[PDB]
Ligand binder design. Structure first.
Ligand SMILES: O=S(=O)(O)c1cccc2cccc(Nc3ccccc3)c12
Ligand SMILES: O=S(=O)(O)c1cccc2cccc(Nc3ccccc3)c12
Ligand SMILES: O=S(=O)(O)c1cccc2cccc(Nc3ccccc3)c12
Ligand SMILES: O=S(=O)(O)c1cccc2cccc(Nc3ccccc3)c12
Ligand SMILES: O=S(=O)(O)c1cccc2cccc(Nc3ccccc3)c12
Ligand SMILES: O=S(=O)(O)c1cccc2cccc(Nc3ccccc3)c12
Ligand SMILES: O=S(=O)(O)c1cccc2cccc(Nc3ccccc3)c12
Ligand SMILES: O=S(=O)(O)c1cccc2cccc(Nc3ccccc3)c12
Ligand SMILES: O=S(=O)(O)c1cccc2cccc(Nc3ccccc3)c12
Ligand SMILES: O=S(=O)(O)c1cccc2cccc(Nc3ccccc3)c12
Ligand SMILES: O=S(=O)(O)c1cccc2cccc(Nc3ccccc3)c12
Ligand SMILES: O=S(=O)(O)c1cccc2cccc(Nc3ccccc3)c12
Ligand SMILES: O=S(=O)(O)c1cccc2cccc(Nc3ccccc3)c12
Ligand SMILES: O=S(=O)(O)c1cccc2cccc(Nc3ccccc3)c12
Ligand SMILES: O=S(=O)(O)c1cccc2cccc(Nc3ccccc3)c12
Ligand SMILES: O=S(=O)(O)c1cccc2cccc(Nc3ccccc3)c12
Ligand SMILES: O=S(=O)(O)c1cccc2cccc(Nc3ccccc3)c12
Ligand SMILES: O=S(=O)(O)c1cccc2cccc(Nc3ccccc3)c12
Ligand SMILES: O=S(=O)(O)c1cccc2cccc(Nc3ccccc3)c12
Ligand SMILES: O=S(=O)(O)c1cccc2cccc(Nc3ccccc3)c12
Ligand SMILES: O=S(=O)(O)c1cccc2cccc(Nc3ccccc3)c12
Ligand SMILES: O=S(=O)(O)c1cccc2cccc(Nc3ccccc3)c12
Ligand SMILES: O=S(=O)(O)c1cccc2cccc(Nc3ccccc3)c12
Ligand SMILES: O=S(=O)(O)c1cccc2cccc(Nc3ccccc3)c12
Ligand SMILES: O=S(=O)(O)c1cccc2cccc(Nc3ccccc3)c12
Ligand SMILES: O=S(=O)(O)c1cccc2cccc(Nc3ccccc3)c12
Ligand SMILES: O=S(=O)(O)c1cccc2cccc(Nc3ccccc3)c12
Ligand SMILES: O=S(=O)(O)c1cccc2cccc(Nc3ccccc3)c12
Ligand SMILES: O=S(=O)(O)c1cccc2cccc(Nc3ccccc3)c12
Ligand SMILES: O=S(=O)(O)c1cccc2cccc(Nc3ccccc3)c12
Lengths: 162, 161, 159, 159, 162, 160, 159
C-alpha cells in the first residue's frame, strides 16, 4: 500500500535562555529535571543503561498515585556542541494506546543571549489504529508547560548551567 | 595604487559562552577594560550614540601613562548573531603612521563554550609604512585582557547572564 | 496547525550524485524527458542553482494542470542535501498552502539510500486530505522508478 | 601572521546585476571575452554555479602564466554579495598561499557602487611582496573598466 | 621485551572520480587493474583463496625480468557499502628482508561527482629490525602514481565500474 | 610521507571486559590515582558528560617531573567495548610529540577478556619520534593495567 | 512462539563437493537442468555468489507458484556447510514467514552423509500448517535422487 501514514510535529520557539541551558535542562538532564520541576508527577529520574552520551536510556518513575507508572527513553543521536538530539520512548503505560514509539529530534542554535529551537517529534501510529488527531495538543502540552516552567527556574537562577 | 593594510585574522576558543564574551569584549569592552585593568585604565564611556550602531566610545588612560585616550566607533553591530565591525580611529596609541585600526568580530555558540573569529586591520596613513610592532603589541594586549576576562567570567557565572 | 507528513526510506542501485542531479538539481528539465506526455517545459525563472532560484514546470496544453514553480530554500549538493518549496501552481489545490520535500541521499556501495520528508501544508483555515497526499507520492515515486530505469541503462548521464 | 589587505570603494554607471553577473558570476568567461590576447578559455570544473563552485582560467600558450583556480565561499546574487578565493596557479608562486576577494555591490540610480576587499594570504613565515598587491589591483581594475565600456555600449548584455 | 615499533603513514586525498569506481579500481579489483594500467610492469594478478569478500588472498605477478617477483595480499576487513577496507601484504620478495608486513586501511566518502579519502599504511618490521624509510617512500610513490593513472583513465571512460 | 610510529597489541585477562573497559578507559583518570597515589594527584573531566568529545585532565604529584596530560575521546562505543582516545596536551610529550592516539577493542572470552589495543605516536611537524618515548609509554600503561587487574580480581564488587 | 523444524539424515555415493555444488551452490541453476518442465530460470539480483548472496527461482509458463526467494546466511564451502533463507515467493501461502534450510555434508568413502534441518517459520497470526511442510521435504528429496543419478552418469560434471 501507500505505506506512509505517520504523524509528526515541528515547531520553533524563542526563549531568553542560552541554548546550552535548555539542552542540559530539557535533553541532557530532562530525566532529572522533569522530577524537580513537577515533583508532584515524578518520583524518580535515573539512567538504566548508559554512562551519558548516545546509547544511554532513561527511566521516568511517576509518583505511585499518577495514572501512569514510568517512561522508557533511550539516547539515539547526540551532537553535543550544536545541541542536536534524537531520542524516543519505547515502553511505558504513557503510550495511551496509539503509538509503537515516539522519536524526539531536536536541534538548537544560539540567538543573541538566548536560543532558537527546531523540534521534530514523531508519534508512530500502529496497525489498525488512527492516531488521535485530537490527542496532538495534549502530548505537546505537557512538554510546553514543562518548558515554560524549566525556563522560569532557569531564568531565575542564571548560574544553573551558565 | 591603494595602500595595503596589515590584517589580523584570529580563531579563538573559550569555555565562556557567546553572549558573555561578545558582551565583555566588544560593547562593554571599554567599560570592562577599566574594571579589567584599573592600573592602566582611567575611564571608559560612550561619547556619540546611545549604544546603537555608529556609536563612539572614549577610553582614557591613568595620567602618567604615555598614552592619553582611544576612540572607537561601531561600524555595525549584528548583536543577534554576535557580529561587530569597529574601528580604532583616534588617540596617540595610533602614533602618527597609523590612520585607523579596524576590528571585525563574529562569535558562535559551541556547546557550553564559544568559538570566536576576529579580524583586525591596520590602515597606514598615505605614504607611511606598517608598524609591525603596533600590531604585535596590539595583539598581546587585546588578548592578555581577554584571558583575564575569561578567568573572571569562568569564576563569576552571574556576570553577563 | 495541521501537520500530516510522509517519511520515505528508499534505496536504489543508482549512485547518489546521479539521483541528486536527476531528481533534485535538474528535476524540472528531467520531468520533461521522462513524461513528455504531461510536461511541455521545465526551467529556472531566476537564480543560479543556489538558494532563491526558482524553476517553472509547464504541463502540456491539453493537461488539466497548468504549471508549478519550485524555489530552492537550501542546498548542499556535495552532500546530496536539499529542502525545496512547491509554493505556487495550478496543481496546488485550495486546501494546500504548500508541499515541502527534504532530501538527503548517501552512497551505499555502487548505489544509494535516501530518506525523504515530504510535508503537505494547508492554507489558513482549511484541511488536508489523504487522497491528495497519496497521489503526490505516486507521482514522485513513479517519476524516480521511470528514472532509475534510465540512469541504470545510460551510465554516462550525469556520471 | 601578517596579511596585506586592500579595501576600496568603486562606482559605475552600469546596473549592479549586470556588473555582478559579468565581474563575479560569469567572470571566468568574460575574462576571455574582454582580453583574448591573455586568456584562451574560462570554465567551471566543480559545482553548478553556486557556493563551492571552482573555475579554471587558462592563459594563451605564449603567456608566462599557466592557469589559475578560484572557489566561491559565499554567493548571494540577490544582494550582490560574493567572497571567492584564488587557491591555485602560478601567479601565486611560492610566497603566496591564496587571495580572497569580497565584493558587495548595490544600485545608485541606473548604476552602482561597490566595496571590494582583496587580502593576499602569504605562506607560513613568508613575506607578501607589497608589489604582488599592486599588480592584482591593476589587472582587475583594467578588466573592470574594459567590461564596463562594453556593457555601457551594449545595453542588452546581462540586462 | 617491548613491541616492535611499526611505521605509519597517514594520507588524505581527493579525486573527482566517484568512490564506487575508485574503491573497485583501487581496492576490490586492484589486483587486476594493476595489470591493466602498467603492463610493462605486471604480468598477471588473481584470486587464489576466497570469494572476493573477506579472507581473500590475491597473488600479483611481476613481469619476468622485473627485479621484484610476487606478492600475496590478504583482505582483513571488507565493508564494500561504506568504501572501507583493511588488507595485508605479507608474502613476496617486494618485502625487504627487514619487513614482516604492510597493512592498509582504506576508507572513501562521496563528494558530488567524486570522492574524499583517508588511507592508513603501516609497515611492520621483523624481530629486531629498523624499517628502512627507503622502502616506505618506495611503494608509496608507486601506488600514488597508480592512483593518478587510474583516476586519469576513469575520468576518461565514465562507465568503467559505473 | 611524514610518518608516525604505532604499537599494535593483543591482550588477555581473567577480568571481564565491561569491568576492564570501565577501569582502563572511562575512569582511567580516577583509578590512576587509586593505583599510583604516588605518581598522580587527581584525574578529572574538564569538558563532557562522557561521550565523543569528552576531555579529561590528570594531575601528577608535587614532586614528580611531570605536570599534566589531557585526553580526547575521539570515539567511544561502550556497547562494543571499543574506544579511541588521544593524548593531546601535557608535559609528557616533550617538544617532539604532536599527539598520542589510543585505539582499544575488548572482547568477552568466557569469564574473561581479550583486548586489541593500538597506540600511535604522531610527531610535531619536522620533529622525530624516539622509541625511548614509546618503550617508556607502553611499559607505564601496562604496569598500571597489571596493578588494576590484581585489584579487581581480589575485589569482585568493584566495577561489577 | 511456534516453528516447524524437521531433521533428516541422508547418505549418498556422490562425493560432498559435487553434492554441495548441486543442491546448494548451483541448485537454482540445476533445478532448470533436471526439472526443466517445471522451471524457467534461477538467477541473482543483488548477490556476490558467496555469503550474503540472494537467488530467485522462476517456474514454467503455467505453474501455480512464481518464484522463490532464498538468501544465504552462513557459508563455508570448505566444510560443505550452508544456510539459505526462503522469505519471499508464494509457496509461503500466507502461513510461512520463511523456511530455513540448513545443510552440512561430510566425505565418506567416495560418497557422503548429510544432516539436513529444514524449517518453516510463522508470521504472527498465521497457522503452522501440517501437510504443507510435508510437501517441502517431498519436492527436495525427489530432486536429490534425480541429481544423484545424473552425477553418476556424467562424472566430470563439477570436478
Ligand atoms: O533543583 S531544583 O532547584 O529543584 C530545580 C527546580 C526547578 C527547575 C529546575 C530546572 C533546572 C535545574 C534545577 N536544578 C538542578 C538540580 C540538580 C541537578 C541539575 C539541576 C531545577
Ligand atoms: O511530554 S513530556 O515532556 O515528556 C512530559 C512533560 C511533563 C509532564 C508529562 C506528564 C505526562 C506525560 C508526559 N509525556 C506525554 C507525552 C505524550 C503525550 C502525553 C504526555 C509529560
Ligand atoms: O517547548 S517545546 O517546543 O514544546 C519543546 C518540546 C519538546 C522538547 C523540547 C526540548 C527542548 C526545548 C523545547 N522548547 C523550547 C521552547 C522555546 C525555546 C527553546 C526551546 C522543547
Ligand atoms: O502554556 S500553558 O498556558 O502553560 C499551557 C498549559 C497546558 C496546556 C497547554 C496547551 C496549549 C497551550 C498552552 N499554552 C498557552 C499559553 C498561552 C495561551 C494559550 C496557551 C498550554
Ligand atoms: O585597545 S586594546 O587592544 O583593546 C588594548 C587592551 C588592553 C590594554 C591595552 C594597552 C595598550 C594599548 C591597547 N590597544 C592598542 C591598540 C593598537 C595599538 C597598540 C595598542 C590595549
Ligand atoms: O531524464 S531521463 O529519465 O533519464 C530520460 C527519460 C526519458 C527519455 C530521455 C531521453 C533523453 C535523456 C533522458 N535523460 C537525461 C537526463 C539527464 C541528462 C540527459 C538525459 C531521458
Ligand atoms: O534573477 S536572474 O535572472 O538570475 C539575474 C539576472 C541578471 C543578473 C543577476 C545578478 C544577480 C542575481 C540574479 N539572480 C538571482 C535570482 C535568484 C536568486 C539569486 C540570484 C541575476
Ligand atoms: O494518476 S492520476 O493522475 O493520480 C489518476 C488518478 C485517478 C484516476 C486516473 C485516471 C487516469 C489516469 C490517471 N493519471 C494520469 C496522470 C497524468 C496524466 C494522465 C493521467 C488517474
Ligand atoms: O511534483 S511531483 O509530485 O513530484 C510530480 C511528479 C511527476 C508527475 C507529477 C504530475 C502531476 C503533479 C505532480 N505533483 C503533485 C504534487 C502533489 C500532489 C499531486 C501531484 C507530479
Ligand atoms: O499507480 S498505482 O499502481 O495505482 C499505485 C497504487 C498504489 C500505490 C502506489 C505507490 C507508488 C506508485 C504507484 N504507482 C506506480 C506506477 C508505476 C510504477 C511504479 C509505481 C502506486
Ligand atoms: O523516492 S520517491 O518516491 O521517488 C520520491 C518522492 C518524492 C520526492 C522525492 C525526492 C527525491 C528523491 C525521491 N526518491 C528517491 C528514490 C530513491 C532513492 C532516493 C530518493 C523522491
Ligand atoms: O567584448 S567583451 O567585453 O569581452 C564582453 C564583455 C561582457 C559581455 C560580453 C558578451 C558578449 C560578447 C562580448 N564580447 C565579444 C568580444 C568579441 C566578439 C564577440 C563578443 C562581451
Ligand atoms: O560538481 S559537478 O561536477 O557539477 C557534478 C556533476 C554531476 C553530479 C553532481 C552532483 C552533485 C554535485 C556536483 N557538483 C558540485 C560541485 C560543487 C558543489 C556542489 C556540487 C555534481
Ligand atoms: O609571473 S608574472 O606573470 O610575471 C606575474 C603575474 C602577476 C603578478 C606577479 C607578481 C610578482 C611577480 C611576477 N612575476 C615575475 C616574473 C619575472 C620576474 C619577477 C617577477 C608576477
Ligand atoms: O600601473 S603601473 O603602470 O604599473 C603604474 C606604476 C606607477 C605609477 C603609475 C601611475 C599611473 C598609472 C599607472 N599604471 C597604469 C597601468 C596600466 C594602464 C594605465 C595606468 C602607474
Ligand atoms: O584575476 S584577476 O586579478 O582579476 C586578473 C584579471 C585580468 C587579467 C589578469 C592577468 C593576470 C592575472 C590575473 N590575476 C591576478 C591575481 C593575483 C595576482 C596577480 C594577478 C588577472
Ligand atoms: O574593479 S575592481 O574594483 O578592482 C574589482 C576587483 C575584483 C573583483 C571585482 C568584482 C566586481 C567588481 C569590481 N570592480 C567594481 C568597480 C565598480 C563598482 C563595483 C565593482 C571588482
Ligand atoms: O628478567 S629478565 O632476565 O630481564 C628477562 C629475560 C627474558 C625475558 C624477559 C621478559 C620480560 C621481563 C623480563 N625481566 C624482568 C626483570 C625484572 C622486572 C621485570 C621484568 C625478562
Ligand atoms: O580498460 S583497460 O584498458 O583494461 C584499463 C586501462 C587503464 C586503467 C584501467 C583502470 C581500471 C579498469 C580498466 N579496464 C577495464 C575494462 C573493462 C571493464 C573494467 C575495467 C583500465
Ligand atoms: O604498492 S602497490 O600498490 O601494491 C604497487 C602498485 C603499483 C606498482 C608497484 C610496483 C612495485 C611495488 C609495488 N608495491 C610495493 C608495496 C610495498 C612496498 C614496496 C612496493 C607496487
Ligand atoms: O593513492 S593512494 O592515496 O596512495 C592509495 C594508496 C594505497 C591504496 C589505495 C587504495 C585506494 C585509493 C588510494 N588513493 C586514493 C587517493 C585519493 C582519493 C582516494 C583514494 C590508495
Ligand atoms: O606522481 S606523478 O605520477 O609524477 C603525478 C602524476 C599526475 C599528477 C600529479 C600531480 C601532482 C604531483 C605529481 N607527482 C608527485 C610526485 C611526488 C610527490 C608529489 C606529487 C603527479
Ligand atoms: O580506591 S578504589 O576504589 O578502592 C580502587 C578502585 C580501582 C582500582 C584500585 C587500584 C588500587 C587501589 C585502589 N584503592 C586504594 C585505596 C586506598 C589506598 C590504596 C588503594 C583502587
Ligand atoms: O618521568 S618519566 O616517567 O620518565 C617520563 C615519562 C614520559 C615522558 C617524559 C617526558 C619528559 C620527562 C619525563 N621524565 C624524565 C625523567 C628523567 C629523564 C627524562 C625524562 C618523562
Ligand atoms: O598515560 S599513561 O600511559 O596512562 C601512564 C600511566 C601511568 C604512569 C605514567 C607515567 C608517565 C607517563 C605516562 N604516560 C606516557 C605517555 C606517553 C609516553 C610516555 C608516558 C603514564
Ligand atoms: O548438464 S545437463 O545435461 O544439462 C543436466 C541435465 C539434467 C540434470 C542435471 C543435473 C545436474 C547437473 C547437470 N548438468 C550440469 C552441466 C554442467 C554444469 C552443471 C550441471 C544436469
Ligand atoms: O568405496 S569405493 O567404491 O571403493 C570408493 C570409491 C570412490 C572413492 C573411494 C575413496 C576412498 C575409499 C574407497 N573405498 C571405500 C571403502 C569402504 C567404504 C567407503 C569407501 C572409495
Ligand atoms: O523445496 S525446494 O528444494 O525449494 C524444491 C526443490 C525442487 C523442486 C521444487 C518444486 C516446487 C517447489 C519447491 N519448493 C518447495 C518448498 C517447500 C514447500 C513446497 C515446495 C521445490
Ligand atoms: O535431504 S534432501 O531431501 O535431498 C534435501 C532437501 C532440502 C535441502 C537439502 C539441502 C542439502 C542436501 C539435501 N539432501 C541430502 C541428501 C543426501 C546427502 C546429503 C544431503 C537436501
Ligand atoms: O514424493 S513421493 O510421492 O512421496 C515419491 C513417490 C515415489 C517415488 C519417489 C522417488 C523419489 C522421490 C520421491 N519423493 C519422495 C520424498 C520423500 C519421501 C519419499 C519420496 C518419490
Amino acid at each position: 500500500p501507500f505505506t506512509m501514514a505517520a504523524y509528526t510535529i515541528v515547531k520553533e520557539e524563542e526563549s531568553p535562555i542560552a541554548p546550552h541551558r535548555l539542552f542540559k535542562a530539557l535533553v541532557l538532564e530532562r530525566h532529572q529535571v522533569l522530577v524537580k520541576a513537577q515533583p508532584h508527577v515524578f518520583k524518580s529520574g535515573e539512567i538504566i543503561e548508559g554512562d551519558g552520551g548516545v546509547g544511554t536510556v532513561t527511566k521516568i518513575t511517576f509518583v505511585d498515585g499518577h495514572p501512569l507508572t514510568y517512561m522508557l527513553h533511550k539516547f539515539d543521536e547526540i551532537d553535543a556542541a550544536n545541541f542536536y538530539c534524537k531520542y524516543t520512548l519505547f515502553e511505558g503505560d504513557v503510550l495511551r494506546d496509539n503509538i509503537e514509539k515516539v522519536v524526539y529530534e531536536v536541534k538548537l542554535e544560539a540567538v543573541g543571549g538566548g536560543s532558537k529551537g527546531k523540534i521534530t517529534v514523531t508519534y508512530h501510529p500502529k496497525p489498525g489504529c488512527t492516531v488521535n488527531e485530537e490527542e496532538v495538543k495534549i502530548g505537546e502540552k505537557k512538554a510546553y508547560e514543562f518548558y515554560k516552567q524549566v525556563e522560569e527556574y532557569l531564568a531565575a537562577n542564571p548560574e544553573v548551567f551558565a
